[PDB]
């Protein structure tokens, strides 16, 4: 009777994968989005006699960390990072986080925020002079010139905190901001040091890395698997319906 | 004669499980209840009902609980029900799970029906004993 559950599980987890895939495709135009990878893992039931039952469960082993195609928008605050680089922004709960969205905005009082998260430099969050033109160098050096001031006063202000961390060492949080894993936190400390070897380009925005071929193939496979599991379910139900007649004396 | 009580308890328990599954299916897309809280999916709890001390017996539904599974969040800031971040709590009903529950409860219901028919026939025939 329980074979109608095994297949059911697969069908249900199929829907889960579909959700993940949709969550990727809804973010096809999101700047600095890292598509979540999905993977079914098989769990066998440990018990007496043959283990003729092995269920599935979906999981998301992190994200896909191949940098996307760059968007050339003529805005000096827009930045694109070298592969495996992260900007450090203060998250909601007063803690550090890593993001790839380089669309930096200037607040009314001069605070640099990415998606409302105040960017953190070498000395903490950055305070920009009131209403000034910002130019970011290839290493993160920030130069401010109150537009209209002597152009030889292009005074530097600070430097962004750019962090090197591969995709294996980082896990996503529920707010969409990436953080270090527990093992990586133990092996590389809590707060990562800024790597001066990371190059940052100003005037270009990085897009998402949602590969449409993979999404289409995943949808086709998910649909076929769902149809197979529903069929197994129908067969099992019909068999049990026929078998219930054995109790009539 | 205890078998009538056992199988009737089984039929009642499976009917309760089927009703809970139907309630879960009906309100998979529901937004709010009579109050401002979302619809938390229901599940019955099966237990072994042995009023005397002989270990085993029929099945009884101890309680109906609301699954502690996380609530789905949909971004709808214009809805008055949305929280500070503009999210609305939609139920976590597992559609495939509930359909499978419906079919499995139906099959167990029929098995108990067949058991009741057979034992009723046997208890009718035992009155004929030697006459």
């Amino acid at each position: 009777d329980h074979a109608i559950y095994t297949a059911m599980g697969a069908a249900s987890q199929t829907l889960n994968q579909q959700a993940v895939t949709a969550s990727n495709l809804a973010n096809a135009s999101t700047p600095g989005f890292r598509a979540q990878l999905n993977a079914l893992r098989a769990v066998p039931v440990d018990g007496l006699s043959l283990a003729t039952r092995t269920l599935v469960t979906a999981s998301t082993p992190g994200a896909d960390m191949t940098p996307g195609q760059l968007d050339y928008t003529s805005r000096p605050l827009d930045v694109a990072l070298q592969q495996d680089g992260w900007l450090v922004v203060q998250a909601a709960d007063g803690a550090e986080g890593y993001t790839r969205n380089g669309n930096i905005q200037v607040g009314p009082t001069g605070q640099l925020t990415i998606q409302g998260h105040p960017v953190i430099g070498e000395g903490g969050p950055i305070t920009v002079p009131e209403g000034s033109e910002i130019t970011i160098a290839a290493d993160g050096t920030i130069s401010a010139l109150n537009p209209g001031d002597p152009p030889n006063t292009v005074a530097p202000v600070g430097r962004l905190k750019l962090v090197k961390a591969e995709g294996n060492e980082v896990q996503r949080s529920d707010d969409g901001l990436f953080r270090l894993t527990a093992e990586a936190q133990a092996e590389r400390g809590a707060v990562l040091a800024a790597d001066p070897s990371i190059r940052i380009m100003s005037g270009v925005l990085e897009g998402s890395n949602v590969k449409p071929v993979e999404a289409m193939t995943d949808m086709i496979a998910n649909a076929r698997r769902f149809e197979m599991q529903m069929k197994v379910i129908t067969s099992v139900d019909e068999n049990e319906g026929r078998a219930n007649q054995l109790l009539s004396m | 004669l205890n078998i009538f009580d056992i199988a009737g308890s089984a039929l009642a328990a499976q009917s309760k499980r089927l009703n809970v599954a139907a309630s879960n299916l009906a309100n998979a897309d529901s937004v709010t209840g009579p109050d401002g809280q979302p619809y938390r999916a229901k599940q019955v709890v099966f237990q072994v009902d042995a009023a005397p001390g002989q270990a085993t017996g029929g099945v009884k539904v101890a309680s109906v609980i609301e699954s502690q599974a996380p609530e789905k969040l949909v971004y709808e800031p214009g809805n008055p029900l949305a929280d500070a971040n503009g999210y609305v709590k939609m139920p976590n009903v597992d559609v495939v799970g509930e359909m499978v529950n419906t079919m499995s409860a139906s099959r167990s219901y029929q098995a108990n029906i067949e058991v009741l028919n057979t034992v009723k026939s046997m208890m009718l025939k035992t009155l004929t004993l030697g006459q």
């Binding site: 559950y5 059911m8 599980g9 249900s12 769990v43 269920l55 469960t57 | 499980r17 599954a21 599940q43 019955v44 709890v45 099966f46 237990q47 072994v48 609980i65 699954s67 599974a69 597992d94 799970g97 509930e98 499978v100 529950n101 499995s104 409860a105």
Partner: peptide
């Protein structure tokens, strides 16, 4: 002490 029947108890969840 049997638990919830059907869907909830037939899904892989970490022990607690």
């Amino acid at each position: 002490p049997g638990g919830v029947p059907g869907a909830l108890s037939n899904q892989p969840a970490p022990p607690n």
